[PDB]
Amino acid sequence: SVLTQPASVSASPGQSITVSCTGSRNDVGGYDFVSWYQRHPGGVPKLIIYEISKRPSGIPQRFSGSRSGNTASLTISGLQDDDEADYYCCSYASYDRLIFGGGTRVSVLRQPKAAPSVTLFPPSSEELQANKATLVCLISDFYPGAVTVAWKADGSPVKAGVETTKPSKQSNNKYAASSYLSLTPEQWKSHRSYSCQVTHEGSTVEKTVAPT
Amino acid sequence: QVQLMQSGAQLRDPGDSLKISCKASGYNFIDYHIHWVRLAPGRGLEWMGWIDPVGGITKYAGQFQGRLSLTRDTSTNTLFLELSRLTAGDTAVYFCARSMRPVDHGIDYSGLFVFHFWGRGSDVLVSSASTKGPSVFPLAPTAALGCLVKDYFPEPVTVSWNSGALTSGVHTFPAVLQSSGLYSLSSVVTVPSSSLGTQTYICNVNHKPSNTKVDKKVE
C-alpha cells in the first residue's frame, strides 16, 4: 500500500506550506503512529514528526503535525532554504506493517516560477529499421525542480515502457528532465498518436506526435 | 553517539543476491529493533522489514516475503540484509535504521514504528551489462533537432556538435537508466530555422569505455 501525498508544493521564504498524507482506517486513521521524514536530494532521511504531532530532538516547533480522519498533515511555517526537500509520511498498518507515502517535494522559491519547455520526438526511421522504437520527451528550463510526466497512446494512459529521469539543476538554476517511452514498431504504428504530458506547479503541458 | 555504518554501493546482475551489512554502535545493541527501508525510483520510501536482535525474529513487508532474509551477529553488533533473485525493480538506495525506542513486550510497541537514526545508504544498481557501446539515432527537426544516444553501459558519454563548432543552443540531457539496465541520453540543439537545410548538423558521440566514436548526420 502507498499512503497518498501530493507530488509537490512550493512557497517563498518565510511562508507556510502544508503537506497531506491520505490513508485508511487500517493505518493513518486507525492508530496514532504517524511519522514524517525529511530527505534532501542525495541525502539521508531524517525524522521530523512522530506519533502524529510529536517532535523528536532538534526539530523546531515551526514543524507541526496533525490528523483529521484518515488524513495526516505536516505544516512547515517560516520556510527556510534548508526546508527544501522530499517529505514522506509513514504509518503503522494492521497488522505489524509499516507503510510510506509516495513523497512530496517541498520547494522554497528563490527565483520566479518558470514553466517547462517540452519537446517530443517520434522514433527515427533508422531506429524503426532496426526493429525498435523510442519516443523522447525532453523537458527543460523549469523552476522549481519538480515535475510529473504521463504518457498517452491515442486517448488512453500508457504505463508500460516509461522511464523518466529526476530533475537535474541546469547552469541557470532552472531544471531539466526527460522521459522515454520504449515501444515495439508494431505498437507504434498501431496507434494514431502518442502524447507526453508534463505537469508542473499544477499546470500540464502536452506534446503529441503521430506515426503518419 | 548512535551510529549505523553501512557497506557501500554495489552493481549486481539480475538474478544475483544482494548482501549488505550495517554495523551498529553507540548504544546497547540487543535492546533495539532494526529496520531496513529502500528508496526506489518512481517510488517513495519502501519499508522492507524489521529484525529483533534478541532472538533474530523478523517481520517482512508483503512484497519481500520469500526473497528477503534479515540476520544479525550479536558478537559484532552487525546486521545483514540478503535480497534474493534481483530484478531491475530492485535498483534503489538501501537503508538500515534504528527503532526509536525498545519494545516493552506485551505492553508497548510504539517505539518499533518510528525510524530515528539512519544508515548512510547503499546505492544499488541491478544491471547485467557488461561494457556496451551506444546506438546513435538522429532526432529530425528557431527549430529543435537532436541525437538519441541509445543503450550504452557504463557511463559516461560525451556529445559535441559539428566537430565542436556548434555550442549555442546545445542541451545535452542527463541519461536515463532503462529497465534493460542500459543508459540512454539525448542531445538537442536549437538552431535558427532558415539555417535549416542551409546548414548541416552532425552530432559527434564518444563512449570511451567501449571505444566508440560515432558521427551522425541529422537530416
Numbering used by the authors:
A (entry chain L): 2 to 9, 11 to 27, 27A, 27B, 27C, 28 to 95, 95A, 96 to 106, ...
B (entry chain H): 1 to 52, 52A, 53 to 82, 82A, 82B, 82C, 83 to 100, 100A, ...
What did the study's authors say about this model?
Two moderately broad and potent, clonally related monoclonal antibodies isolated from a single donor, 3BC176 and 3BC315, recognize a glycan-independent epitope that was proposed to be located in the vicinity of the V3 loop and CD4-induced (CD4i) site5. Structural analyses of the 3BC315 and 3BC176 fragment antigen binding (Fab) by X-ray crystallography, and in complexes with BG505 SOSIP.664 by single-particle cryo-electron microscopy (cryo-EM), reveal that the 3BC315 and 3BC176 epitopes are very similar and situated at the interface between two gp41 subunits. To study the paratopes of 3BC315 and 3BC176, their corresponding Fabs were crystallized and their structures were determined to 1.95 and 1.89 Å resolution, respectively. Like many HIV-1 bnAbs, the 3BC315 and 3BC176 Fabs have long CDRH3s, both being 19 residues, in comparison to the average human CDRH3 length of ∼15 residues25.
The complementarity-determining regions (CDRs) of the two Fabs are in very similar conformations with Cα root mean squared deviation of 0.58 Å for the variable regions, suggesting that the two Fabs likely interact with Env in a similar manner. The 3BC176 Fab structure was docked into the 3BC315 complex structure via superimposition to explain differences in some of their neutralization specificities. We mapped the residues that are different in the CDR loops between the two antibodies that could potentially make direct contacts within our Rosetta model. These residues were Y33H, N52D, N53V and F56I in the HC (3BC176 amino acid is listed after the residue number), and S27aN and N93S in the LC. Although interaction with these residues does not seem to be the primary determinant for neutralization, residue 53 in the HC is an asparagine in 3BC315, while it is a valine in 3BC176, indicating that sequence variability of gp41 residues in with region may affect antibody potency. Out of the 39 viruses tested, 3BC176 (median IC50=1.69 μg ml−1) and 3BC315 (median IC50=10.00 μg ml−1) neutralized 25 diverse isolates, and were complementary to 3BNC117 and 3BNC55, as they neutralized 10 of 13 strains that were resistant to these CD4bs antibodies. In contrast, mutation L619Y in HR2 increased the 3BC176 IC50 against JR-FL and BG505 15-fold and >78-fold, respectively. Substitutions at positions W623 and E648 in HR2 of JR-FL resulted in >40-fold increase in IC50 of 3BC176, and another point substitution N656A resulted in a 13-fold IC50 increase. With JR-FL, 3BC176 also destabilized the trimer rapidly, inducing complete dissociation within three hours.
